[PDB]
C-alpha cells in the first residue's frame with residue numbers, strides 16, 4: 001500500500017464520514033437488493049417489508065455501526081499497513097463475527113457495495129478504486145486468519 005494510496009483513501013473517505021447514517025442506509029439497501037440471500041443472516045430484517053427498512057431504527061443504527069468500524073480502519077491505515085493498530089480493528093471484527101458462519105463471499109459482496117456508495121459521494125479514479133479494494137482485502141485477510149482459531 002502506497003504513500004499516495006493511503007492519502008487518497010483518507011482524503012476521499014472524509015466525505016463519506018461526514019454523513020455516516022445516510023451512507024449506511026444507502027449501503028445496506030443496495031446490498032440486500034443486489035444480494036438478497038445475505039438477508040438470511042439478519043432474521044429481524046426480513047420480517048419487514050423491503051421498502052420500509054430505510055426508515056427503521058435498528059436498520060439505520062446498524063448501517064452507521066458498520067461504517068464507524070470501517071472509519072477506525074482508515075484512521076490506523078499506514079504505508080504497507082505498517083501500523084499494528086490496523087490489525088487491532090479487524091481482530092475485533094474476528095471476535096464479533098466468528099459466532100456466525102458468514103462465509104468469505106458475503107464479505108466480498110459488501111465490499112463491492114461499500115466501494116460503490118463511496119463512488120456516488122466522491123468520484124474515484126481507477127487507481128483509487130484499486131487501492132480501496134486492497135484495503136478491504138487486507139482487512140478481510142486479517143479477520144479470517146484470526147477466526148481460524150475457534
Ligand code: HEM
Nearest residue numbers: 038041042062065066067069070093096097102106107110
Ligand atoms: C465491512 C465488513 C463488516 C463490518 C465492519 C461489520 C461490523 C459490525 C458491527 C460494528 C456490528 C455491531 C456489533 C454490536 O452492535 O456490538 C456487527 C454485527 C453483526 N454483523 Fe457485521 N460487519 C461486517 C460484515 C458483515 C457481513 C458481511 C455480515 C453478513 C451478511 C455481517 C453480519 C452481522 C450480524 C448478523 C450482526 C448482528 C446484528 C445485530 O445483532 O444487530 N457483518 N457487525
